Design a protein around this ligand. Structure first.
Ligand SMILES: Cc1ccc(CNC(=O)c2ccc[nH]2)cc1
Length: 321
């Protein structure tokens, strides 16, 4: 032994054991063989005999066979402020946003165009390629902890994948939208009603509810999705543009949309807006608009942000009906 190696070993093993208890109980998705887990738990037990100081009421072995997994929505701070978006509902407004952008920067700004998803915003933090925290927006500075619930979403990976061109960052704060596809929204409503529960009025309400469960196992059996669409605080990653950032996200395994395009001027922005006004109904989830961002990171830095919103992006919202 070495007391430092004792501690090292314990932590690692408890971490591995706790992760598997989560996969087996909270989700129904074990990733090792049913037999392999048993050795691990023995060892950890085997491990706390020698060193009884290690066994605590919070240890994977004692006091948590089956349980200890609950969400309490406690406040957690975002690394970088998570601002909301300013909206534009009319063509002049967008033109006016674009004019002002072109009074500050020139033709150097290109516009990334994405489909705005009407769901629940989620913020994930990855430390050394491992998911450590998932959070709701809250007030922009502080959100609620729903890490366990996010851990059940299929679209969200626990770990990031080692890129060739893209090395995993030391810290990555990534933002996205959590949502249901239409068919699954309906399906869940049926199931709920089948157990004498009230159904959800819309898919956004349904996703929010499904995410916010005190028992995350509930969340695991609901077909929630996620698309990433923004970055917060990052270390070890310095992308020149947002479009290029999406390439690294993809490489690492984060979910990204396939409907993003890059436009060079307002005319190009206008075509996408018009196009999706006519084609948004064909997407399988709710799109309530198009978000237009300035693609260059350095240009978004110069433009900055106000207390409530960024000045380098704007969301064009369509008529409700
Ligand atoms: C693959 C995998 C991962 C995690 C676990 C956790 N615990 C148990 O299954 C269990 C409880 C009682 C008997 N067995 C199992 C299997």
């Amino acid at each position: 032994q070495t007391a430092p190696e004792v501690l090292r070993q314990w932590q690692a093993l408890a971490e591995e054991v706790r992760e598997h208890q989560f996969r087996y109980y909270v989700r129904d998705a074990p990733i090792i063989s049913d037999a392999e887990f048993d050795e691990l738990l023995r060892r950890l037990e085997a491990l706390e005999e020698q060193h009884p100081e290690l066994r605590t009421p919070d240890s994977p072995t004692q006091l948590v066979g089956g349980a200890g997994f609950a969400t309490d929505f406690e406040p957690v701070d975002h690394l970088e402020r998570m601002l909301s978006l300013d909206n534009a509902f009319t063509a002049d407004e967008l033109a006016a946003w674009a004019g002002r952008i072109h009074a500050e920067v020139g033709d150097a700004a290109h516009y990334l165009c994405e489909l705005k998803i009407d769901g629940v915003a989620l913020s994930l933090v990855y430390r050394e390629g491992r998911l450590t925290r998932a959070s709701t927006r809250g007030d922009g500075r502080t959100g609620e902890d729903v890490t366990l619930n996010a851990r059940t979403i299929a679209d969200v990976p626990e770990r990031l994948t080692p890129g060739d061109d893209y090395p995993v960052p030391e810290v990555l704060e990534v933002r996205g939208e959590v949502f249901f596809r239409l068919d699954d929204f309906q399906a869940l409503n049926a199931s709920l009603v089948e157990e004498g529960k009230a159904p959800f009025a819309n898919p956004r309400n349904s996703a929010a509810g499904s995410l916010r469960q005190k028992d995350p196992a509930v969340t695991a059996r609901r077909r929630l999705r996620m698309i990433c669409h923004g970055l917060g605080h990052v270390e070890g990653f310095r992308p020149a543009t947002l479009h290029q950032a999406y390439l690294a996200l993809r490489a690492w395994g984060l979910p990204v949309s396939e409907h993003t395009t890059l436009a060079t001027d307002l005319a190009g922005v206008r075509e996408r807006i018009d196009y999706w006004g006519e084609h948004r109904h064909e997407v399988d989830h709710e799109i309530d608009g198009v978000v237009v961002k300035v693609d260059e990171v350095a240009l978004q830095r110069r433009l900055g942000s106000t207390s409530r919103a960024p000045r380098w992006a704007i969301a064009y919202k369509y008529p409700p009906e």
